Structure formats: structure tokens, C-alpha cells
Amino acid sequence: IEEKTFKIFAEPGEKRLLKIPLPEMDDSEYFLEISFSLSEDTPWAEKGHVVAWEQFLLKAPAFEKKSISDGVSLREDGKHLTVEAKDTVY
Amino acid sequence: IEEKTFKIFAEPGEKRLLKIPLPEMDDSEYFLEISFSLSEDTPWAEKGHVVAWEQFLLKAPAFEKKSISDGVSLREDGKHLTVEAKDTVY
Amino acid sequence: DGSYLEDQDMWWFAGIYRDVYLYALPKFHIRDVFVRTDLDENYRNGKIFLDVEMRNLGEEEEKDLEVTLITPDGDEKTLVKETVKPEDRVLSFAFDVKDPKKWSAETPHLYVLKLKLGEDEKKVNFGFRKIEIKDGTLLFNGKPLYIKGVNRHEFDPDRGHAVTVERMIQDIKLMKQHNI
Amino acid sequence: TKLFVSGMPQIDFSVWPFSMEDLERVQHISELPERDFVTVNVDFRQMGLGGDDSWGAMPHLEYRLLPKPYRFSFRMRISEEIPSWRVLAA
Numbered sequence A, B: 001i002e003e004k005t006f007k008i009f010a011e012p013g014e015k016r017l018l019k020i021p022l023p024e025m026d027d028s029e030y031f032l033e034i035s036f037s038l039s040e041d042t043p044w045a046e047k048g049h050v051v052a053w054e055q056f057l058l059k060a061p062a063f064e065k066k067s068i069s070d071g072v073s074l075r076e077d078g079k080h081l082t083v084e085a086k087d088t089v090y
Numbered sequence C: 001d002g003s004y005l006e007d008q009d010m011w012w013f014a015g016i017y018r019d020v021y022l023y024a025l026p027k028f029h030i031r032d033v034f035v036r037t038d039l040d041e042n043y044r045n046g047k048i049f050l051d052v053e054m055r056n057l058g059e060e061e062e063k064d065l066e067v068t069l070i071t072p073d074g075d076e077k078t079l080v081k082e083t084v085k086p087e088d089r090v091l092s093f094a095f096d097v098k099d100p101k102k103w104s105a106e107t108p109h110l111y112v113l114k115l116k117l118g119e120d121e122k123k124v125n126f127g128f129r130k131i132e133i134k135d136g137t138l139l140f141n142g143k144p145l146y147i148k149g150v151n152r153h154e155f156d157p158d159r160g161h162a163v164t165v166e167r168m169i170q171d172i173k174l175m176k177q178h179n180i
Numbered sequence D: 001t002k003l004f005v006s007g008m009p010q011i012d013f014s015v016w017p018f019s020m021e022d023l024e025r026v027q028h029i030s031e032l033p034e035r036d037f038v039t040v041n042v043d044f045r046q047m048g049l050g051g052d053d054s055w056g057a058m059p060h061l062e063y064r065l066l067p068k069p070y071r072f073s074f075r076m077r078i079s080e081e082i083p084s085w086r087v088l089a090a
Helices: C165-177 D020-025
Strands: A030-037 A050-059 A073-076 A081-085 B030-037 B050-059 B064-066 B073-076 B081-085 C028-039 C046-056 C063-070 C076-084 C089-097 C111-117 C120-126 C131-134 C137-140 D002-007 D012-016 D039-043 D074-079 D087-089
Touching: C028 C111, C028 C120, C046 C063, C046 C076, C046 C111, C063 C089, C076 C089
Parallel strands: B064 D087
Antiparallel strands: A030 A050, A073 A081, B030 B050, B073 B081, C028 C046, C046 C089, C063 C076, C063 C111, C111 C120, C131 C137, D002 D074, D012 D039
């Protein structure tokens, strides 16, 4: 639903902070992915090759529980129990 | 939703079994009440006076959780936060 | 080689020690019958589950199948009456019965199924009863059952394993008179 | 207009035609004053009444709120009709 490019300056061993502005969220599940790729071609790989990525849960979903009002039928014989609902028979 | 009269023969100290045929139940909460009343007038009370009763849970309800899609507005000033939804303001 | 599975603690005898006979059935006949019962959760109303296996040995014409239920009182009811083409098939039926008399060792009430396919006639005795395990307890028609039993060998001091009906009846009456 | 409250899954409540301060002040039934409001209490629980005696006895241990952490929630709606107590927002 949303993609954005960035550049970060960090020398060997350095830790740097990255700030991501989040949208307003509904009852769905939301995951964030952060990746780093080759800016231009190398002798061993092409521009856009991913070298590193990580993923994080932003928000768990809200589960819905619905009350069913429609009916189910049941027929017994000597070997089988048969259960009918809508247009499926178990 | 259902009422029924009965008579039970039990001498002082006796335990007797009572069988109650139950209906098919939906997602509501169901309670059973069993009572005993005066068959006819006494010097101290009238026909229908209850002398004893007990109640029992037959079935717990099934709770429904609904996903809300409609929006809520928010206005801040120096002293108040105001929240609007449908035709109610908090 | 059979003798290796017949090593019971008993006398080793031999011979034709039970009855021999010849009988004749129509070309199209009932080979087998399986009658089972169920009872509801109040042990009040019953169901009959009936499997009828038919066998054809060169018949061509269609025959009439009738199944009759006789009660312990003696009343009769037709359960099935249909025409069947001659073939090897298992027919299955399920019937409901209201407040049947239940079979126990204390009260042995027997129903009769009468089965007739053309000129082939057979009868089977059956009872309404249910054995079950509920939470490690043994139940018979819904009541806790105590087995007050004995082991019996089919043995006679004059005839060996060739025991008669008169001796079988003597054994059973003696068992019941001693609370077995 | 209906003010509706439902438990998650239950509450205790009471409604009075005066304040808690009025009820604590007056020592006779005749002195209970006239007010232009209703006091509403919505509770998790209240301690027992006791009464083994009335000159020192406490309620029994199993009817006291001993000081440990507690939580409690309920749903409120202001509308023209009574909604279903069994339906909540996910």
C-alpha cells in the first residue's frame, strides 16, 4: 500500500536512526519491510540486487466474530451421518 | 419462552429425579427456574404462594465482535479535546 | 496343524461330534441377515438397522421381498414389501420403533423378524439392548452392570463334547437358581 | 433518549435521586432533600455487608477487596433504541 526510497550515511561500525511516518490503520494486519540494494552494476551483480532486508509487525489485526442464524439438517442411517448446510453436504 | 406444571411424590427425607426436555438453543443466554407453590389456600397464605425455588444456567451466550469502518474526528484547543462520532460529541 | 491353536486345558477327543444335514434353497435366495438396534439418550425409543444380502444362481424372473416384525405380545407389522430383480446385492433399511420392550438377563423380551423372498423363508430373534462405557463405568440399557459369572466347558461324562439340549437346559436352570 | 451500559461481561450498578454527600449527611428519612439530577454508579465490585455482629465483626475474607492490582471495563452508548448487549466493536 506504500513504498519509499531513502539514503543513510553510516561508516563501518556506526549505528544511525531511521524515522518512518506511519499512516492511520484499520482492522487489517500491517507489516513493515526495510531493504538495501546495489545503487549501480558491479562485476558480480546488477543494479537493484538486494544485499540486506528485515521485517517487523506494525499492528496485529482485529478479529470479527459473527452470529450465524441459518439452520443445519441431520440424517442418520445404519452406516452414515449426513449434515447439510447451504449447498454443501458433509 | 416456555412454562410447564408438574407434580412429584417424595416422603420426608426422599430424593427424586426430575427430567426436563430442553429446546434447541440459539446464541442467547438461557436460565432454568424450578419452583414449588401452595396447591390450595391455607390459614396463613393463598393458593399460588411460592415456598421454594432454585435457578440454573443452561447455556452461556455467544458474544459477537463487529468491525467498525466509519470515522471519528478530533479537535484540540488550550483547555479541551473534542471527539465527534455519528451525532454524539465527547 | 490346526491342533497348535487348540491347546486348551481339556481332554483331546476326535470325530463328527455335532449334527450333519442336507437342505435346499431357491436359485435366488437370502444368503445373510445382520439386525442391529440403537436406543435414544433416555433409553426410551428405538431404531432397527437391517442389512439383507441376496445371492443369484441362474434365476431371471423378479421376486417379491416381504419383511414382517412380530412383537413380544404377538402383534404384526409389515416393514418392507417390494419387488427385486435377481442379482447379488446388499439391501440396507432403517426403521423407528416407539417404547419397545428392552431385553435383559432379568427380563428377556424377544422380537421376531420374518423375511420372505419368493418361496425362501427365514426368521431371526433379536432384542433392544445397548452396552457402553461412560467414564470407565460399564452400562447396560443405561444402568451399571456387575458381571456375576462362571466359565463353562461344553462337557458330558458319558458323551464327551457331544452334549444334548436336555443337558444344556439343566445347566442354565441350575445357573439361574444360584444367582449366576 | 436512552443511556445504555453493558458489562464485559458484567457490572454492578445503582441510581439515586440525590448525591453521595447528601446520603452520608442526613440521619432521618424525612431530611432526604429534593434534587434536579440522578447519581449513577457503575462498579466492578463493592465489599460485603457482613453482620456476624455490629460492634467489631468484619465481612468474611472472601468478600473483601484486598490491596492488589485490579482492572475493569464497560461499553456505553447514547441513542434512541436499546442495542444488543451481545454485540461489541472488535
